[PDB]
């Protein structure tokens, strides 16, 4: 019942990460104009439904590992190690760029967390792993879209 | 231009209102334990969606009016005027209890904006009122425990 | 040869799964009173899952090169606990005893997982699965009573 | 009255189906060779069908006031036969040693139906269906002429 | 950075294993004949559909890692390490026999890579960890002796 | 049954042409990037399944005509008269360009194989005739985005 | 080229047949009266959609073959051979009988173009063999007295 | 009045008949990186205009007359020229189409300024279209 | 006024070759026995629904050309060029085999009718060419050597 | 002793169902005029049943140890009545003959069900159900009013 605390804490941050992410992901959708902003929409939409479920997968685990997932704004700014999204109603070319860097962060933490878990809660590692999969893939989608 | 500027601000306030709201529902969703707790799960769901999309409709007008909707963890706490949500792993009565409270101020705020518009924007008003309806009916349902 | 030791873990694991989707089918058979259906609505689906994890782990055994033993005599053989006592009763009563069964299953599954990191990651990724799912049904059950 | 005199049979008939179906899966994981999917395709519809019989004679013990034990121990205790022991083996084998298994079950299902004549009036007729159906499978299985 | 080049390198080698495989696989589909020969069909189609999938998967993965995949026949001979599948218009016990050995090659190699990535990129490892499960599964099934 | 062999030999050469085609096609799917890159995706998919289909159609044919179709890397190469596809991760207005070229040779040989089939087999010709249409068409589709 | 252009023409002439054919097909839908008039709409509706398809299939082909299918009206009145459906609002019969006569001079030309291509463009010919057999049924259909 | 109307309606019919022949025409002829953006914006609009013809045709049958829908009539009662543009780029065709629609929307606006003295019913069917046609032009002018 | 008279009759022989074939097929289906015997059922059945299908196409095509399709036991014995299926309740091998025999005849006759049509009727040709594809294919399928 | 001539009457019934559906499709490829689909519409689902009867009347000939003869020359042999005889002909002309067709079919079925009073079991629980839905069809004909 000791190590089960450390675990529930990495996942807690991750929850917030996802929440801020999927929140931001919606922010971009609304704030995109210029070129093929539709191509962006059709790219962000499924990333929102997914990143959203991730925050749900990550939540229930914390619940199971004897603890309460905090998914409120005030909460997801306490865990937040980085800063708010800055791009207003701008371009795809500036937005994808913004998102490129957002993921630079999400991708990393996720890694430096899957990396922190082996010895602790493996069932939880795999979760954050399968996630990193689609996480990293999307950040590429963002990149190719922009070359 | 300036009228549109203030309609936005109002709609920006509402945007955040909603965004905090649908983020809460999921929170109460992951943390509601109890005997018939699954009915809360069952009620949160259609709502979570309903709200998530209402946040969408308002972020359409803000942009329409030439202003940038802001639905990020900052924007929400920045123009907020309520607490977070104190309820953790708790009982059906516990959430349903504060969940009701949440929907009071939320509609209170809404009921104001709908009037704070009247003069200004008919269209954007004819919107928030509709929101107020489904926001009421739900609470009405939340208000009916045991 | 190497698989001859990993086959052991999985063969014990299977039988645990066989025990369970028998025991689990047992309580679903034996409950009366208050909330009748809500339980069969929660158990049925899990029943099918444990039969799944039974069928799967078995296959993985027949794959590594041994005859997966899945007969009653093959169960009690590797079983390391007493049978399931609770006969007819209520929901709050079975779910309570059911909780401790799982603690056992989870425990050993969790245990068997830690034992595989060095021998067969395939079989592990497969336990890792049943693990995370089973644990949900713990919390789930745990959360039906207050 | 005559109730607790009949139960000692519908139990050793519920467990009959239990040891029957559980063996089905066991064989299902071991039938190997040219037309092995042959066996696979014929076991699956029975497995569930025989599971449907474990149920029918599990409820008519709860209804007829009692608690049917569908657990490991509640099988090795009232087991009147021996554990199915065909390993990872050819269709040829399993189908044969599966003819016998069915013959014996249809042997009990014969004696018991007859030993429950001038007592119960519908339990016998429910049981008759299984005698009817379980028999039907043997035909198909007795097409072990390949 | 260097590591990613040695992950992409293994993943590229793995890719060619899937490409040669599903080509080989379909190839078999066309020449397996006899009595219950459709069995081989009914058996093969999903594996081909699956191996082809894994290809796209491990490919997209290399793409994600900053190296670009190679699905061309020159690229799969340029990093194979075994000769083309042999059997032509033959029997079930003939193809299945060889196809076993083929998969011996696949799995044995897939395992190598898993253990070899265990110290580089678990994400990619999860990817192979998964396939491995299925590949080995087919192997068993192929062993309708 | 001496001219049938000649037909087959043509079809086999056609076979490897398709195989190299669909492998190459997916190879571009995986590498094409830029703003409109998903567009190329969208055009390539229906083609890739189409081609894979032809590959099947032709083999089945050879096999029918009493010869044995070859679908392995060597085979593809052995009867290949062209250069391996050469673009890596690259722009649309690049992959389509090189892909435009690939197709000319495909269509060229497909025309040739047709004419050569004139006095040989109208059936094989009719098959190849069909493909030619969806292949020639696809190239227009390729040289329109250019 | 040298020839491909000639093909493009046989095909262009065809396109206008098709266009002027569905312009006309619709024309009668509008102008049909009488008792069993819905028996007509019933058969026309799906043929209109079909003949528009063909128009496309042909247009995209001309496009594939070097360029510029022309589908405007001044382009129809041009490479047309026939008059112009003169029938107005009339008996089902009054139309079917007339329409029957239209399909004649279409199949007639469509048959010419096929023969005309056995030596020029085998791929395109395949495309007009597809339509030929279809339109021809519809005329048999129309020949429901 | 409805022979002064069955005229305007017929002139309208062909405007729609020409439009949708000409529309499917630019569809076949667009080329360049994103000619599909056009393909994907012509399609529904093509079914629409065909729809519009379909309608104004019924109207001409109701007022007890004959809808003329053959190439003959179209060239006859029209007052403009064939769509000039062949295989050309998207900016090329969109510009032409944007110009094509003025004529059609402009003419339609006229038949509406007329039908107000004669048959509001049709003058309504026409108003409907005008707005929808007006909107396609908008959508179309969005190109850069 | 005669181009058809020859062609149509040419299609009628074809039509009856099918009407025969699909009953024979159905015949075999009621007469295959022994070990597994169902491999045949799963094989034949789809094929009958195919042949019965071809029976129409060609009948309709006969009907479309101007003459009348005669698909009654009368014609299928008259324009026949062989003898009835001579196999009763027998094994798969001796049956599937004898069925292979039937196909040789059906393909050879068709190939002939396909040639005869070269410069005569291409639509009726790219209709037989179509059947020959699936008819040859079956004969192969059949050949469970 | 009569066992061989009991099912003998079924082999008779067998071919009739054949001749019947073969006829149907013939009339089907030939019924024409204003409301010809009208006849098509009613004929299709019937052919299913009729062919099913020939499947059901064969699933029996087989069981009591006998070879079901379902070939063209088997019909004309164990036949009695007249080969059909109507091509491109009016709506009523076919319905009319399709009537008479069934009469001789209904007549015999009953004349056989009767000859099977003191003999076969499910046969006298079969040809009725048949004769039922057959006799049914016969009324469904009668050309409106």
Q: Which tokens belong to C109?
A: 């599954």
- F114 contacts on G by Cβ (under 8 Å): 122
Quickly list H helices, chain I. 3-29, 38-65, 75-78, 93-116, 125-142
> Are H123 and H115 spatial neighbours (Cβ–Cβ below 8 Å)?
yes
d(Cα B16, Cα B59) in Å, to the nearest integer? 10
> Are F64 and F124 spatial neighbours (Cβ–Cβ below 8 Å)?
no
d(Cα H125, Cα G45) in Å, to the nearest integer? 23
Residue F33 backbone dihedrals phi, psi, to 5 degrees: -140, 180
Q: How many CB atoms lie within 10 A of CB A13?
A: 17
**Radius of gyration of chain J from Cα atoms?**
16
- In Å, how far are F97, F99, F130, G39, G125 from F104, measured between CA atoms? 11, 9, 17, 49, 20
d(Cα I75, Cα I69) in Å, to the nearest integer? 9
| Residue among J56, J71, J82 with most chain I CBs within 10 A, to mutate | J71
> Are F140 and G63 spatial neighbours (Cβ–Cβ below 8 Å)?
yes
Q: Which tokens belong to J39?
A: 């006849």
Contact G122 F129 (CB under 8 A): yes
Would you call J80 an interface residue with chain I, using a CB distance cutoff of 8 Å?
no
The beta-carbon contacts of A117-120 under 8 Å, at least 24 apart in sequence, are A117/A7, A117/A10, A120/A3, A120/A6, A120/A7
Q: Please report all neighbours of H, defined by 3+ CB atom pairs within 8 A.
A: F, G
| Residue among B18, B61, B72, B95 with most chain A CBs within 10 A, to mutate | B72
Residues 6 or more apart in contact with residue C50 via CB below 8 angstroms: C17, C20, C21, C24
At residue F34, the 3 state secondary structure works out as coil
d(Cα B9, Cα B79) in Å, to the nearest integer? 10
Instruction: Give the max Cα distance, chain J.
Output: 56
CATH number given to A1-147: 1.20.1260.10
> Are E63 and F89 spatial neighbours (Cβ–Cβ below 8 Å)?
yes
Would you call F49 an interface residue with chain E, using a CB distance cutoff of 8 Å?
no
- G140 contacts on I by Cβ (under 8 Å): 60, 63-64
- I129 contacts on F by Cβ (under 8 Å): 122-123, 126
Would you call D146 an interface residue with chain E, using a CB distance cutoff of 8 Å?
no
Residue that the structure tokens 């309806």 belong to: B133
Beta bridge partners of A91: A33
Residue G3 backbone dihedrals phi, psi, to 5 degrees: -110, -50
User: Burial of E104 by CB count in 10 Å (0-12 exposed, 13-18 middle, 19+ buried)?
Assistant: exposed
Q: Please report all neighbours of I, defined by 3+ CB atom pairs within 8 A.
A: D, E, F, G, J
> Are E124 and E7 spatial neighbours (Cβ–Cβ below 8 Å)?
yes
Q: Which residues of B64-98 are buried (b: 16+ CB within 10 A; e: fewer)?
A: ebebbbbbbbbbbbeebeeebbebeebbbebbbeb
Residue I101 CA to its chain's centroid (Å): 12
Euclidean distance between the first and final Cα of chain F, in Å? Answer: 47
CA distance C89 to chain E (A): 42
Give the closest residue to F54 by CA, choosing from F117, F115, F11, F114.
F11
Quickly list H helices, J1-145. 3-6, 8-28, 36-56, 58-63, 72-77, 91-115, 127-141
> Are I15 and I55 spatial neighbours (Cβ–Cβ below 8 Å)?
yes
Give the closest residue to D10 by CA, choosing from D57, D70, D72.
D57
Q: Is F56 annotated as a binding-site member? A: yes
Quickly list H helices, chain F. 3-29, 37-64, 73-78, 92-116, 122-142
Strand duo H88-89 + F32-33: pairing: unpaired
> Are C39 and C89 spatial neighbours (Cβ–Cβ below 8 Å)?
no
d(Cα D102, Cα D133) in Å, to the nearest integer? 11
The beta-carbon contacts of I132-138 under 8 Å, at least 24 apart in sequence, are I132/F123, I132/I107, I133/F123, I133/F126, I133/F127, I134/I50, I135/I103, I135/I106, I135/I107, I135/I110, I136/F64, I136/F123, I136/I107, I137/F60, I137/F64, I138/I47, I138/I103
Residue B86 backbone dihedrals phi, psi, to 5 degrees: -75, -20
Residues 6 or more apart in contact with residue B3 via CB below 8 angstroms: B120, B121
Looking at residue E37, what DSSP letter applies? Answer: T
Using the Cα atoms of residue G19, residue G20, residue G22 and residue G26 in order, give the sign of their dihedral. positive
Q: Residue I34: left if φ>0, alpha if ψ -120 to 50, beta else—which one?
A: left
Q: Residue B67: left if φ>0, alpha if ψ -120 to 50, beta else—which one?
A: beta
At residue B81, the 3 state secondary structure works out as coil
Instruction: For the domain made up of B1-146, give the CATH fold.
Output: Ferritin (1.20.1260)
Instruction: For the domain made up of E1-145, give the CATH fold.
Output: Ferritin (1.20.1260)
> Are B78 and B20 spatial neighbours (Cβ–Cβ below 8 Å)?
no
> Are J11 and J78 spatial neighbours (Cβ–Cβ below 8 Å)?
yes
| Residue among J17, J23, J29 with most chain I CBs within 10 A, to mutate | J29
Quickly list H helices, C1-146. 3-29, 37-64, 72-78, 91-114, 121-142
Contact B30 A88 (CB under 8 A): no
Q: Please report all neighbours of G, defined by 3+ CB atom pairs within 8 A.
A: F, H, I, J
- B38 contacts on C by Cβ (under 8 Å): 38
> Are C31 and C86 spatial neighbours (Cβ–Cβ below 8 Å)?
no
User: What residue numbers of E does the annotated binding site for Fe cation cover?
Assistant: 29, 56, 60
> Are I79 and J40 spatial neighbours (Cβ–Cβ below 8 Å)?
no
Residue A33 backbone dihedrals phi, psi, to 5 degrees: -150, 170
Which DSSP string do the residues of A9-36 spell out, in sequence order? HHHHHHHHHHHHHHHHHHHHHHTEESS-
d(Cα J100, Cα J81) in Å, to the nearest integer? 11
Q: Which tokens belong to I11?
A: 């299609």
d(Cα A71, Cα B80) in Å, to the nearest integer? 16
Q: Is J59 annotated as a binding-site member? A: yes
Beta bridge partners of I32: I90
User: What resolution in angstrom units was achieved for this structure?
Assistant: 3.3
| Residue among F28, F34, F38, F39 with most chain A CBs within 10 A, to mutate | F38
Residues 6 or more apart in contact with residue B64 via CB below 8 angstroms: none
- C35 contacts on B by Cβ (under 8 Å): 35-36
Residue that the structure tokens 């209170």 belong to: B108
Length of chain A: 147
Strand duo A32-33 + A90-91: pairing: parallel
Beta bridge partners of D90: D32
Q: How many CB atoms lie within 10 A of CB D60?
A: 19
Query: Please, do chains J and D touch (3+ CB pairs < 8 Å)?
Result: no
Experimental technique, in short, is X-ray
Would you call G81 an interface residue with chain F, using a CB distance cutoff of 8 Å?
no
Q: Which tokens belong to G123?
A: 């791929």
Q: A90: part of which helix (H) or strand (E)? A: strand A90-91
> Are C97 and C142 spatial neighbours (Cβ–Cβ below 8 Å)?
no
What angle do helix axes E92-117 and E38-64 make, rounded to 10 degrees? Answer: 20
Residues 6 or more apart in contact with residue J144 via CB below 8 angstroms: none
d(Cα I64, Cα I56) in Å, to the nearest integer? 11
d(Cα E70, Cα A121) in Å, to the nearest integer? 37
Contact A136 E126 (CB under 8 A): no
Would you call B37 an interface residue with chain C, using a CB distance cutoff of 8 Å?
yes
Q: Residue G89: left if φ>0, alpha if ψ -120 to 50, beta else—which one?
A: beta
Length of chain H: 144
d(Cα B143, Cα A147) in Å, to the nearest integer? 54
Residue that the structure tokens 């360049």 belong to: H32
Q: Residue A33: left if φ>0, alpha if ψ -120 to 50, beta else—which one?
A: beta
At residue A141, the 3 state secondary structure works out as helix
CA distance G119 to chain F (A): 11
Give the closest residue to D86 by CA, choosing from D41, D139, D34, D29.
D29
Beta bridge partners of A90: A32
Residue D52 CA to its chain's centroid (Å): 11
Would you call B71 an interface residue with chain C, using a CB distance cutoff of 8 Å?
no
Q: Which tokens belong to J120?
A: 């076969």
Cα atoms in the Cβ-side hemisphere of radius 13 Å centred on H127? 10
What angle do helix axes J127-141 and J36-56 make, rounded to 10 degrees? Answer: 170
Give the closest residue to H28 by CA, choosing from A82, H58, C19, H36.
H36
User: Burial of I32 by CB count in 10 Å (0-12 exposed, 13-18 middle, 19+ buried)?
Assistant: buried
Breaks, C-N > 2.5 A, in chain A lie after none
Q: Which tokens belong to A4?
A: 């089960």
- In Å, how far are A72, B18, B76, D72, H136 from B82, measured between CA atoms? 12, 12, 11, 57, 46
**Radius of gyration of chain B from Cα atoms?**
16
Residue G6 CA to its chain's centroid (Å): 20
User: Burial of D79 by CB count in 10 Å (0-12 exposed, 13-18 middle, 19+ buried)?
Assistant: middle
- In Å, how far are A134, E47, E56, E109 from E14, measured between CA atoms? 20, 16, 11, 8
Residues 6 or more apart in contact with residue H69 via CB below 8 angstroms: G23, G24, G26, G27, G30, H13, H17, H53, H57
Give the closest residue to D93 by CA, choosing from B23, C67, A111, E92.
C67
CA angle F134, F138, F139 (to 5 degrees): 125
CA distance I129 to chain G (A): 12
Q: Domain spanning H1-144: which CATH class is it, in words?
A: mainly alpha
The domains of chain A are located at: 1-147
d(Cα B63, Cα A30) in Å, to the nearest integer? 8
Beta bridge partners of G32: G90
Q: How many CB atoms lie within 10 A of CB I81?
A: 9
d(Cα I89, Cα J66) in Å, to the nearest integer? 8
d(Cα A7, Cα A58) in Å, to the nearest integer? 11
- C26 contacts on D by Cβ (under 8 Å): 69-71
């Amino acid at each position: 019942d000791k190590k089960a605390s450390d675990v529930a804490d990495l996942l807690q941050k991750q929850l917030s990460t996802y929440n801020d992410l999927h929140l931001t992901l919606k922010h971009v959708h609304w704030n995109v104009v210029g070129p093929n902003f539709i191509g962006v929409h059709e790219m962000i939409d499924p990333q929102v439904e997914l990143v959203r479920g991730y925050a749900d997968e990550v939540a229930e685990r914390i619940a199971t590992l004897g603890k309460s997932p905090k998914g409120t704004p005030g909460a997801i700014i306490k865990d937040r190690t980085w800063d708010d999204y800055s791009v207003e109603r701008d371009t795809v070319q500036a937005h994808l760029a913004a998102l490129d860097l957002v993921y630079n962060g999400v991708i990393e933490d996720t890694r430096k967390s899957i990396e922190k878990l082996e010895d602790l809660d493996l069932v939880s590692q795999d979760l954050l792993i399968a996630h990193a999969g689609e996480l990293e893939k999307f950040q590429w989608f963002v990149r190719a879209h922009l070359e």
